[PDB]
């Protein structure tokens, strides 16, 4: 998955999956891939 805000089953918490989940959780430091720029992604991470 590229990354999309999804509501996890427990506590109905917003969470990022795929690349955004990997990057925002500290597992990854940079995303060099066809990552489209849009509001939902730009609100949390910052694109070059």
């Amino acid at each position: 998955k590229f990354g999309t805000q999804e509501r996890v089953n427990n506590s109905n918490k917003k969470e990022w999956n795929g690349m955004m989940g990997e990057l925002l959780s500290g597992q990854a430091d940079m995303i060099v891939a066809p990552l489209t720029i849009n509001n939902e992604r730009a609100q949390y991470i910052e694109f070059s």
Binding site: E22, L23, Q27, D29, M30, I31, A33, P34
Partner: protein, 410 residues
Amino acid sequence: KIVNIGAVLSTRKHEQMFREAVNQANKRHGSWKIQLNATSVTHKPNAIQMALSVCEDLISSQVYAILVSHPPTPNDHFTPTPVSYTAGFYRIPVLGLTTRMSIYSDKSIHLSFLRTVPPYSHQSSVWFEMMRVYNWNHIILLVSDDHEGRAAQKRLETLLEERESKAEKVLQFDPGTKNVTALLMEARELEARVIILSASEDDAATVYRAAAMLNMTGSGYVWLVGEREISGNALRYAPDGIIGLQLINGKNESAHISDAVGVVAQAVHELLEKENITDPPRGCVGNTNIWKTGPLFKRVLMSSKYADGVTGRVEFNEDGDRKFANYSIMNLQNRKLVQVGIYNGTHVIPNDRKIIWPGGETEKPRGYQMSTRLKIVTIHQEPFVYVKPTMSDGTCKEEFTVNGDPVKKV
């Protein structure tokens, strides 16, 4: 006319000097009619015994405010709670003398508790000031899972939100955990080198030993801690170069008793200046209604400024603490705590002493060390990121384009 004041104290000698302080406060500015009294009771080993004692001895004596202090025994597991909750039933204000727990700061639970000693959770303010002085922008919080650590973390986050900044990681560890190496290993992979610890003496010692095992006390690291982390067993294993804090009169029950008696006497006179004051109840048994002038008595206590104080200018904030305390910055040089500055009510001032940072270096270390190794994440997109299985040896074949240049692979 006579205003009774109760004192939960530790020793007979301290109660005698409490009576002396009450007499001294009675001599000065007596409002021409009011002559204060003084009743005192020693702390009891069991909480129920103390609850019954304060009901029978203090509450039955028409006490307006109750002075409570820690017992001489080193155990400090919320001893003044039964006092604040027997005198809190009738909104009778309680005066804490050596109680630095932050749980009492919440007024939804402690309705009528006011202390002269600010709690540990205010130490975070000092750290922010240090973060303003030495220009440290990246920090790591190491807090306990109890109420004190959560309160300190919340206060520090509230302070940091004004600067539009946040701590990189706030690691919460349960009190009394013997193994904490996992959290410190997690913290080592981060970039920030400003490690801030907020834990009890035993937990501070455990964190210190785990950091020593992980070579985290060497050069390039800076530690900011509180009073509990540089006193007792935590001082035995404290790394050299740590920046602790100490209260100037935190363990001085004498000055606290004197200033608390002065403040409560001034507040009693101010209250009796006003109108429609009700008299205090007799005994826990037989009276269930609250004291009508309890709220206003606590409010007048919270609005009284003791000008000439033995512990300094005595004030009160909306949370019920002193709000103005002198924190002495103690650095551990050569296994000895030496003062390298002092934090007044609102600012920190250094002195001629030189701060020896951990590792022995004199120069101020940078806040963080940048990481030149980056964790790169990619996905299998055919035109952009081809992904192929490697050979048995571990490296896949060299390939050449139509031009003949090698295809760079990772």
